[PDB]
Amino acid sequence: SRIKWAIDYITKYFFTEGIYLQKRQREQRLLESYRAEGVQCRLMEEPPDRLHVLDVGSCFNPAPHLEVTALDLCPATEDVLQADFLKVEVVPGIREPELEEGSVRRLPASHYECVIFSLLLEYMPSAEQRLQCCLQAYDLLLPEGILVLITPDGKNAHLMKNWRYSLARIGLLRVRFEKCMVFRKAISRELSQHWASIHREEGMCEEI
């Protein structure tokens, strides 16, 4: 199912395969590549024994080592917090959701190792609001955290496949695609932005 894949990938990324260090190396080699041709990096400390995971877009909630917080506009069960993800304020200095009158008002910034969008993008009315969802995700994620996008099989699923330029400009780089899509918060946004800069022609070809 859709839940198993994300959990498996999360486990591989932080613990069993060390993909977070594989992609840290890919990005370090890339930044040195640019540095030799003429930057502040933010890395993650060793992954915690208990990951912090935010699931958005599931009306149902889907453990040791896993602290899952689920949010949706239209929750089916009390186990999912009611929220409009686009209006939630992502702010530092807190670690737990802040609720006013039964709705989430603030979520912790730079707190989650993983944000899962469980069809969230399929609900959005525009390309603009899909991008905004990703901007929220980026602010929620710790350095080197992952955004996991879901669409079980519009004519094509909205996985931001053709949006690596705009996502790179925000700081997110694609790290996996399986017919599920995963983006990573890069060690440096300036790095990701420059990569976007060098592929501007190809990126403008896909995003217009």
Curated annotation (Swiss-Prot):
Binding site for S-adenosyl-L-methionine: R2, G57, D72, L73, D84, F85, S118
Coiled coil: none
Biological process according to GO: cellular response to amino acid starvation; cellular response to methionine; methylation; negative regulation of TORC1 signaling
Top-level taxonomic group: Eukaryota
S-S pairs: none
EC number assigned by the record: 2.1.1.-
Knockout or disruption consequences: RNAi-mediated knockdown in the whole organism is embryonic lethal. RNAi-mediated tissue specific knockdown in neuronal tissue, glial cells, motor neurons or muscle cells is embryonic lethal. RNAi-mediated tissue specific knockdown in midgut is viable but results in reduced adult lifespan. RNAi-mediated tissue specific knockdown in eye imaginal discs is viable but results in age-dependent eye dysmorphia with loss of cilia. RNAi-mediated tissue specific knockdown in wing imaginal discs is viable but results in severely deformed wings.
Binding site for S-adenosyl-L-homocysteine: R2, G57, D72, D84, F85, S118
Alphabetic keyword roster: Methyltransferase, S-adenosyl-L-methionine, Transferase
Any one GO molecular function term: methyltransferase activity
Protein name, UniProt field: S-adenosylmethionine sensor upstream of mTORC1
Organism lineage string: Eukaryota, Metazoa, Ecdysozoa, Arthropoda, Hexapoda
